[PDB]
Amino acid sequence: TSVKPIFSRDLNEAKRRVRELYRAWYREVPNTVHLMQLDITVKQGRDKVREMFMKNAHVTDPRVVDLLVIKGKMELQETIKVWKQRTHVMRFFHETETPRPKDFLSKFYMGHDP
Amino acid sequence: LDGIKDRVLYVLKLYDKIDPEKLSVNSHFMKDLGLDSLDQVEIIMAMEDEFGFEIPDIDAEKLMCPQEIVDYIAD
Amino acid sequence: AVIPHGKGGRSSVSGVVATVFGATGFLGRYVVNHLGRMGSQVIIPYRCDVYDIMHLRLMGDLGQLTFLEWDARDKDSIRKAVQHSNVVINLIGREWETRNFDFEDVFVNIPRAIAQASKEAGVERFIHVSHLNASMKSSSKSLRSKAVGEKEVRSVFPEAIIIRPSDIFGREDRFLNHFANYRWFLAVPLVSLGFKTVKQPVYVADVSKGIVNATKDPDAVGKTFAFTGPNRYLLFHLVKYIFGMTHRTFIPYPLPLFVYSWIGKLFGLSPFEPWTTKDKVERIHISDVMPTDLPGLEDLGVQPTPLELKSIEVLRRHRTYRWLSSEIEETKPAKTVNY
Amino acid sequence: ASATRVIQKLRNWASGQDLQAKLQLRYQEIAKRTQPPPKLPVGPSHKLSNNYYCTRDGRREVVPPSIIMSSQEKKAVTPAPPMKRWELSKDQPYL
Amino acid sequence: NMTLNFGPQHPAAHGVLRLVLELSGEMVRKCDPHIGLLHRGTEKLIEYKTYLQALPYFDRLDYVSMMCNEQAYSIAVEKLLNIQPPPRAQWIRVLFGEITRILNHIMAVTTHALDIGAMTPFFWMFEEREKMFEFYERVSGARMHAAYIRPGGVHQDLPLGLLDDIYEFSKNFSLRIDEVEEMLTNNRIWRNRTVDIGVVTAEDALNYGFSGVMLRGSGIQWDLRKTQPYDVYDQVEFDVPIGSRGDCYDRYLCRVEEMRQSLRIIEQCLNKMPPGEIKVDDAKVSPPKRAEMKTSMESLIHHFKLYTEGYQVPPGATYTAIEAPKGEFGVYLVSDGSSRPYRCKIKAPGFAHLAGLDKMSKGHMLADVVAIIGTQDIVFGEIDR
Amino acid sequence: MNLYTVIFINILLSLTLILVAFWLPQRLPFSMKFFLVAITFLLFDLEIALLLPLPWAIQTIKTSTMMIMAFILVTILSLGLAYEWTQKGLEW
Amino acid sequence: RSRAEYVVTKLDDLINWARRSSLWPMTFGLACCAVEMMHMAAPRYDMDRFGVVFRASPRQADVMIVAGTLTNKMAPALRKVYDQMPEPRYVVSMGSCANGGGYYHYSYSVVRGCDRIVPVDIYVPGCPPTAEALLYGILQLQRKIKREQKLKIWYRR
Amino acid sequence: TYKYVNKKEQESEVDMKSATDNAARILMWTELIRGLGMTLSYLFREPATINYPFEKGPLSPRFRGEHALRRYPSGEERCIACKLCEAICPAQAITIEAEPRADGSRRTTRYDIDMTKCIYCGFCQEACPVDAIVEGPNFEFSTETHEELLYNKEKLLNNGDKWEAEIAANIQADYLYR
Amino acid sequence: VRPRSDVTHKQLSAFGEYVAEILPKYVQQVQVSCLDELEICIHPDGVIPTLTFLRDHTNAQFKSLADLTAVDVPTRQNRFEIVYNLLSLRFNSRIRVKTYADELTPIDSIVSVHIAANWYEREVWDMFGVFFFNHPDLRRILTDYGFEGHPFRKDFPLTGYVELRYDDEVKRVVAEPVELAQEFRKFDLNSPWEAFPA
Ligand SMILES: NC(=O)C1=CN([C@@H]2O[C@H](COP(=O)(O)OP(=O)(O)OC[C@H]3O[C@@H](n4cnc5c(N)ncnc54)[C@H](OP(=O)(O)O)[C@@H]3O)[C@@H](O)[C@H]2O)C=CC1
Ligand SMILES: COC1=C(OC)C(=O)C(CC=C(C)C)=C(C)C1=O
Ligand code: SF4
Ligand code: SF4
């Protein structure tokens, strides 16, 4: 315990920042899908944003959250100030890779080490 | 104002998750109709468009029922 | 056999050594893609100069793709290609009867010799591809001839899977690009003003994935699957929709086919790959058959992908700078016809 | 080389320098190949006597850093003597 | 501001550079150079490689000054082992170090001109550069990427004809500098393109960590070769070519002078190279001679262990800086007692210089930026590492 | 006609090339400086015009007036240039 | 000789000679192999003699020489420049860094070969592949371009 | 010792003669003409290029070039699979697995140098005790396909047999140095 | 055996004491290596203060920042060991000030003290993940635009988790989990025998 605060004194204040970033991404998804001529649906993309913002829903510690948005903000900057081209963005969608089943029987049938 | 309220209701009706039936000016989706925190933020965003008015998070967080939205939109 | 080891991506092994004679094709390109992604051993018989098959090299890994010189008239070339393959996939097809190859050859004659040898070799399974709705009596010589083949090959190779795809939707496809390219033509002829020839497109990948899944599944033997699609369409919406995404005017004007078969004959005379074919024309206005058959997609494991979803990518090259940024959402969808 | 005198004279003039004296192309001035076999010298430590390694192994006679001011009147001292000003060259001070 | 990126394929971008330029009209108001296009992981790979098998990596960080780069690792590892190279080896490293600064400067001056538009200076000097590589190849076997300068001493003795051939090259090389000297030093067109462009003030240069010809060009007098004499730079006499004002011309003129001063140092090295051994005689640090390992057991054991396992340098950490042609090249090698390093931070004269591009290229045209990168002599191998 | 004959061959030769070339194979960049130059250019281009008849005007019987006129034109435009220099114009 | 086959063999021989004699290469300029070619462009081993252009923009380039490591940040670009080159186009992979990952194979930031990104025609080996060695590789591309028989294949197709 | 480049020692006050000389330098582009003279001069110099196929740029004995595995004059391959050539390879290029041959001798069942992985350092040449793996002179081994560049024992042994005569001469010239 | 002059080990040692005395609130340890190099060690809070004193003190002018790096000792609670190497062109001496930073306990930025650090601090964030407060523009410099993970951390796999290839189906470069065709052979090299007391 006894940790020093990075930018947010408590999960509460930190959550404020997450809200802002969500908004940012939400407002940006449409633009990217147009400035990058990505073949995705704005709605679809906006769900992806939600996915990511929740993939890390479990974090309880304020410090971890604060870094997470710093990093998140940095990603947005790379996508609104466009330095990240389609190949970079579409990677988020994991479009080419073949999905792996998580069913035990499925894995048994395919991989030595699951 | 009633029309404004209609606009508010209109937006909600549009949002997918919100259920038209449960929807009522007194419904608090955050606690009632089951909208997630993030969803509430998204709703406010749609309102910001329909009403062309920006809402600070501080206040937006305070707005969790459509009536409350109407009230803020009012002022 | 080859025990399948690995995590599933390139540089891994799946144990499918497969001759694929017509890989250079639009469908082919995709077939080699998945086979290579999975890690299968792919032998690609080719006749066109090496320059044209370079696009296939990066697909697949080192020592996973082997290219062999092969001539259809020369039986020996087919013989050595299948020497060490255990799966043979036949995608040999064309739309324009070429001077030295007739629809029979490209569809029935050659695809027979091939499977014939494959058996002599002892290949476990042969997949033969023939166009959808292919009656031995269908109007287009092409479709009928293809039908003739699916029969024969069964006698040369029993229990040989016969996937029968509809016209395919994909980048570099004809079905979608052809119509979109009618732009050059000021008017876009459409027999019966593009009506009563409901058509069900199928994404190329879906077809490819399906085909690949066949190679690695015991359920398919003697099966005549039909990869069809996720939605049917009267040719009218399709044509306009295309023009819609291309953002180019749509001027549907009906043209009596009897005269139009003649237009196909005209371009057909072209020495360099006639753009339209008498046999094409008929095919285009040949109504898509109904879906009562060994199911293909989904049945073989891939859920079809709606046309509108990826249409944007196929038709983008045809737009103008003005519309390049435009997106699918801005445009409208076409309407299906369960009929 | 192998240039008619006139071309050389034009060359030297147009360039403004006796380029012939210092040609870039190499001709029979470069060290011949197959120079004689080399018997290289063996250095120190090859003595067969009084050559104990313990007396010639700086590798690990090195010790852990010396520590000052560990946490666990007086004149001011600089990192080192103030540097000495460099002096202008004498062959070619300027240019 | 019409954002435009100086994309990698463009020749002026050194192959990998994505300068996001904001063009306020043709005048460029901001640059945000996006390096990283050649980051190879050079310093995470070294942690997994023994000290000798990581030497090669140092020849590929700045790829135009190979041996001077591998003289910084060699000095570092040598410090951490409290071993010193034999006298002949130190002269050979100074001989090869100045051949590399002539080689880097011919690279920097001629390619800068290629960018500005002068094409002939590159061809005349590049023929003089293959003459020089030959010296690398004749001493190591590789035209570039030699691996000759080893962590202790150098690898093999100079072939018996090299010093005569280095004299013949050095004897006639100065006319070759004189010739581009006439063709690109007074041309009003060069001066106009180079003079008063990218002026950097003295204190700003120290603050931005420029540390190189960029430091010396604005008049600060700092050469790690005279201030902190590494190897034998205490027994050779040379004049640091300090420039006065800082424009890209004064920096060019300084680079042309250092080529001339290096010929003065190369002369001294050929005139005074000592008879002796080229690698320290401790079999523990430098591998045993081919005949010895094939006739004496102590030598085979020492050859087997050194090649298979390593020197096992004593635990410690050092930052050793040498004056690489670009500027101060330093290796912060942290070492556990293990034969393979723990960290190797390559300070690249170039990471600091490219940072200065935004400040230096201020109130300047699209064309000036091409000169600004050219006068930093930036090779992206060192910056990207 | 003789010119017409030559010119159409000239276009034909070029159209032939491009045709074979295509057949054998088988947003806000603005700086007033740029606009300003174009303008100056015409002010100078117009003057070139008022100066072009000078070869015929040399033979004019007056002569004195010719030169008096021509010298005034060149001088007044050059002063225009002078003020262009003095002002930020021509200083890009 | 008289045969539609002979006329179609001789005319590609003509088309192949033109592409072979004038290959305008486009060097990305990654890492150091670009230097070992700047030496090929230089006077000891002129490339122009052979009909090679020292500097050619992508749209006017017949050959792309990938010299140097193709990091995972330059890959997305190489493909773009390869994709934007005119159709008749060929790739020469120079350096063990490009044809295969070379030193830096196991790095997390280096693509293990440009063959993964762009189809490669001739692979020139060597850490700094010597400049003659590149010149041999370019000459090997010319031998590959002579053998191609595009017109013959169209005639018997 | 330092040296000022581009530092004007003093302010030479303009003298008409000086001014004229200068003005002439700007007006009649005198220095520009000086530059043209230099290039005209070389136009007359002999070009340094070599006919590449017919003539070859000189490489001395230590040139590393292409890997080869040598054999004893008797015909027994030199390698005895000590596998330290694998240990010191910086790039992880050489892969060696061995087993006692029927004769009972030690030999490598598989020796694979991945040349695309190899960075031609020449340490393997250095490390081998029997000096079985050597850096051969040939540099021209460019290959159409990536697989050809990967080399197994048979290609290297064959490479060794083809270039053994020159490899022996090269090692003969440089062994005293090593 | 290298020649060592104790003049320096004495000069530098004294300076160390001088710095320590002047900045006792932050200096924890000040040592001189056997290689005559000083290495004041400061509490992370003393980043701004200790540097500034060295950049602007008449008796210790340390004008240029040679390098900013972060070794990562995973065992150490504070994982990173930010090391700043400085040079004094006036006194021809270098010093190193090294602090400790854990993954989520950021260090102050010295871009104010030396603008050289603007880039190196971005380099330390990209590779190791330490964060620098008050940095003008902290953003990945060396890694790819979409890279996930900090690479030079000792806990990051060399080959990494993603590699790129061109896929025809999608006609675009596409990441895939890394699949290597010859894994990095991990030779164990440490010998079971020590060398000296050290
Ligand atoms: N819309 C569609 O694409 C549909 C296709 N199909 C079937 O799927 C198969 C693949 O179609 P698709 O890829 O579009 O066809 P393509 O026109 O792309 O050609 C397929 C391949 O067949 C090869 N080929 C054609 N003729 C000959 C010949 N005489 N000798 C040797 N090889 C030959 C071609 O090689 P090369 O170019 O080197 O000669 C090519 O690589 C076809 O057989 C077709 O019947 C069925 C329904 C719809
Ligand atoms: C000397 O500095 C550099 C160049 O510019 C002159 C580059 O062109 C290039 C790359 C250039 C090409 C296109 C060969 C590199 C690698 C370089 O280091
Ligand atoms: S191959 Fe050798 S030389 Fe070419 S880039 Fe990679 S390392 Fe530098
Ligand atoms: S070192 Fe020489 S001998 Fe020992 S294995 Fe490698 S090659 Fe064979």
Question: CA I80 to CA C188: how far, in whole Å?
Answer: 69
One-character DSSP codes across E273-339: --SS-SS-S-TTTSPPPHHHHTT-HHHHHHHHHHHHT---PPSEEEEEEEE-SSBEEEEEEEE-SSS
Pick from I169, A41, I167, A38: nearest CA to C206: I169
Name the residue in chain I with its Cα closest to that of H117.
Answer: I182
3-class state of residue H85 by DSSP: helix
C125 Cβ contact partners less than 8 Å away, ≥ 6 residues apart: C86, C87, C88, C159, C160, C161, C214, C215, C220, C221
Ligand 1 binding residues, C-beta < 6 A: C 22-28, 47-48, 72, 91-94, 101, 105-106, 129, 131, 165, 167-168, 173-175
**First vs last C-alpha separation in chain A:** 36
Which two structure tokens, joined as six digits, stand for I76? 């150490």
Pick from H120, G92, G34: nearest CA to E64: G34
Ligand 2 binding residues, C-beta < 6 A: E 11, 14-15, 107, 111, 114-115, 379; G 27, 29, 34, 38
Tokens 């054991």 sit on residue: E301
Quick check: E264 and D38 in contact, CB under 8 A? no
Contact state of A50 with B61 under an 8 Å Cβ cutoff: no
What's the total number of domains in chain E?
1
* Bridge partner list, H143: G123
Q: Which subunits have 3 or more CB–CB pairs within 8 Å of chain G? A: A, C, E, H, I
Question: CA C83 to CA C41: how far, in whole Å?
Answer: 13
Residues of D in Cβ contact (< 8 Å) with H45: 3, 11, 19, 23-25
CB contacts under 8 A, C 194-223 vs G, are none
Which two structure tokens, joined as six digits, stand for C174? 């004809």
Candidates E183, E245, E293; nearest CB to H35: E183
**First vs last C-alpha separation in chain H:** 39
Quick check: G56 and G25 in contact, CB under 8 A? yes
Q: How far is ligand 1, taken at its centre, from the CA of residue C37, in Å?
A: 22
What are the residue boundaries of the structural domains of chain F, listed by start? 2-92
Quick check: E376 and E350 in contact, CB under 8 A? yes
Tell me which residue has its CA closest to atom 3 in ligand 4: H79
One-character DSSP codes across C56-123: GTSSS-TTTEEEEE--SS-HHHHHHHHHT-SEEEE----SSPBTTB-HIIIIIIHHHHHHHHHHHHT-
Residue E232 Cα to chain centre, angstroms:
17
Residues of C in Cβ contact (< 8 Å) with H150: 62
Question: CA G36 to CA G131: how far, in whole Å?
Answer: 5
Element (H, E) at D12: helix D5-15
Q: Which subunits have 3 or more CB–CB pairs within 8 Å of chain I? A: A, C, D, E, G, H
Question: CA G140 to CA H50: how far, in whole Å?
Answer: 18
Question: CA C333 to CA C318: how far, in whole Å?
Answer: 18
Angle at C127 (CA atoms; ends C121, C130), nearest 5 degrees: 130
Tell me which residue has its CA closest to atom 9 in ligand 2: E14
The class of domain G3-157 in CATH terms is alpha beta
Q: How far is ligand 1, taken at its centre, from the CA of residue C93, in Å?
A: 3
Q: Is G148 on the interface with C (CB under 8 A)?
A: yes
Burial string for E354-382 (b: 16+ CB within 10 Å, else e) reads bbbbbebbeebbebbbbbbbbbbbbbbbb
Residues of A in Cβ contact (< 8 Å) with I140: 74
CB pairs under 8 A between D and I: 86
* Bridge partner list, I30: D68
Is residue B67 packed enough to be buried (19+ CB in 10 Å), middle (13-18) or exposed (0-12)? middle
Consult the annotation and say whether E344 binds a ligand: no
Residues of D in Cβ contact (< 8 Å) with H4: 88, 93-95
Tokens 């050092």 sit on residue: E318
Tokens 């400049």 sit on residue: G131
Which two structure tokens, joined as six digits, stand for G147? 């053998």
Nearest-Cα distance to chain A for E200, in Å, is 29
Question: CA C243 to CA C180: how far, in whole Å?
Answer: 6
Pick from G157, D63, I87: nearest CA to C72: G157
Element (H, E) at H109: strand H106-114
Quick check: I71 and I96 in contact, CB under 8 A? no
Q: How far is ligand 2, taken at its centre, from the CA of residue E14, in Å?
A: 4
Q: Where would I find the beta strands (DSSP E) of G8-62? A: 25-27
**First vs last C-alpha separation in chain B:** 11
Q: Is E7 on the interface with G (CB under 8 A)?
A: yes
Contact exists between E and G (3 or more beta carbon pairs < 8 Å): yes
Contact state of G121 with C54 under an 8 Å Cβ cutoff: yes
- The packing angle between helices B37-50 and A11-35, to 10°, is 50
Among the bound ligands, name the one nearest to the CA of residue G113: 3
Is residue F76 packed enough to be buried (19+ CB in 10 Å), middle (13-18) or exposed (0-12)? exposed
Residues of E in Cβ contact (< 8 Å) with A83: 18, 20, 34
Among the bound ligands, name the one nearest to the CA of residue C162: 1
The 10 Å Cβ neighbour count of residue E309 is 20
Among the bound ligands, name the one nearest to the CA of residue H126: 4
Q: Is H107 on the interface with G (CB under 8 A)?
A: no
D18 Cβ contact partners less than 8 Å away, ≥ 6 residues apart: D12
Instruction: Give CB contacts under 8 A, 24+ apart, made by G48-51.
Output: G49/H49, G50/G135, G50/G138, G50/G139, G50/G142, G50/H52, G51/G21, G51/G22, G51/G23
Nearest-Cα distance to chain H for C62, in Å, is 6
Contact state of G73 with I144 under an 8 Å Cβ cutoff: yes
Q: Greatest CA span in chain G, whole angstroms?
A: 60
3-class state of residue E220 by DSSP: coil
- Give G59's DSSP letter: G
Instruction: Give CB contacts under 8 A, 24+ apart, made by I117-120.
Output: I117/I65, I117/I68, I117/I84, I118/E355, I119/E351, I119/E352, I119/E354, I119/E355, I120/E351, I120/I65, I120/I67, I120/I68, I120/I69
One-character DSSP codes across F2-50: HHHHHHHHHHHHHHHHHHHHHHTT------HHHHHHHHHHHHHHHHHHH
Contact exists between D and E (3 or more beta carbon pairs < 8 Å): yes
Taken as a whole, chain F contains a residue count of 92
Which two structure tokens, joined as six digits, stand for F14? 């070029």
3-class state of residue C200 by DSSP: coil
Ligand 3 pocket mutation pick from G69, G92, G104, G134 by most atoms within 8 angstroms of CB: G69
Name the residue in chain D with its Cα closest to that of E227.
Answer: D83
Q: For domain F2-92, give the fold.
A: Methane Monooxygenase Hydroxylase; Chain G, domain 1 (1.20.58)
The 10 Å Cβ neighbour count of residue G148 is 19
H64 Cβ contact partners less than 8 Å away, ≥ 6 residues apart: E141, E142, H120, H121, H122, H125, H135
Name the CA dihedral angle for I174, I178, I183, I185, rounded to a multiple of 10 degrees: 110
Q: Is position B32 annotated as part of the catalytic site?
A: no
Q: Is C319 on the interface with A (CB under 8 A)?
A: no
Q: CA C122 → CA C79, C128, H177, I122, I197, distances in Å?
A: 12, 16, 62, 62, 71
Pick from I129, B41, I130, I148: nearest CA to A21: B41
Pick from C137, C140, C129: nearest CA to C164: C129
Element (H, E) at E21: strand E19-24
Element (H, E) at I88: strand I80-88
Tokens 């196909």 sit on residue: C264
Single-letter amino acid code for the residue at A34: H
- Give H25's DSSP letter: H
Single-letter amino acid code for the residue at H50: I
* Bridge partner list, I107: I132
> What is the DSSP pairing of strand C125-129 with strand C161-163?
parallel
Nearest-Cα distance to chain C for H121, in Å, is 25
Question: CA C78 to CA C115: how far, in whole Å?
Answer: 9
Q: CA F44 → CA F41, F49, F50, F82, F91, distances in Å?
A: 5, 9, 10, 13, 17
3-class state of residue H95 by DSSP: strand
Q: Rg of chain B's alpha carbons, rounded to an integer?
A: 11
Quick check: I136 and I151 in contact, CB under 8 A? no
Listed in sequence order, the DSSP H helices in chain E are 42-45, 66-80, 87-116, 120-140, 162-184, 188-194, 202-207, 213-217, 248-271, 290-293, 297-308, 351-360, 366-374, 380-384
Single-letter amino acid code for the residue at B32: D
Please provide residue C323's backbone torsions phi and psi, each rounded to the nearest 5 degrees: -105, 0
* Bridge partner list, I110: none
Tell me which residue has its CA closest to atom 42 in ligand 1: C93
Question: CA A8 to CA E80: how far, in whole Å?
Answer: 44
Nearest-Cα distance to chain F for E1, in Å, is 9
Question: CA A3 to CA A65: how far, in whole Å?
Answer: 14
Q: Which one is catalytic: B6, B16, B36, B71?
A: B36
3-class state of residue A101 by DSSP: coil
E192 Cβ contact partners less than 8 Å away, ≥ 6 residues apart: none
Pick from C44, C109, C48: nearest CA to C81: C44
Q: CA B46 → CA B41, B59, C223, F42, distances in Å?
A: 9, 15, 52, 54
Pick from G106, A90, A97, A95: nearest CA to C7: A97
Pick from A87, A72, A64, A60: nearest CA to A6: A64
> What is the DSSP pairing of strand C42-46 with strand C18-20?
parallel
> What is the DSSP pairing of strand I80-88 with strand C161-163?
unpaired
The 10 Å Cβ neighbour count of residue G152 is 15
Angle at I138 (CA atoms; ends I133, I142), nearest 5 degrees: 135
* Bridge partner list, H42: none
Contact state of G42 with E129 under an 8 Å Cβ cutoff: yes
Contact state of H118 with G130 under an 8 Å Cβ cutoff: no
Tell me which residue has its CA closest to atom 48 in ligand 1: C167
Is residue F85 packed enough to be buried (19+ CB in 10 Å), middle (13-18) or exposed (0-12)? exposed
Please provide residue I17's backbone torsions phi and psi, each rounded to the nearest 5 degrees: -65, -40
Pick from C80, C81, C131: nearest CA to C288: C131
Quick check: E250 and E108 in contact, CB under 8 A? no
Contact state of E53 with H88 under an 8 Å Cβ cutoff: yes
Name the CA dihedral angle for G41, G44, G49, G52, rounded to a multiple of 10 degrees: -20
Half-sphere exposure of E86 (CA within 13 A, CB side): 24
Tell me which residue has its CA closest to atom 6 in ligand 4: H85
Taken as a whole, chain I contains a residue count of 198
What are the residue boundaries of the structural domains of chain B, listed by start? 1-75
Contact state of D56 with E175 under an 8 Å Cβ cutoff: no
Single-letter amino acid code for the residue at E100: T
To probe the interface with H, which of D12, D15, D33, D35 has the most H CB atoms within 10 Å? D15
Is residue C245 packed enough to be buried (19+ CB in 10 Å), middle (13-18) or exposed (0-12)? buried
I63 Cβ contact partners less than 8 Å away, ≥ 6 residues apart: E203, E206, E207, I55, I87, I88, I89, I90
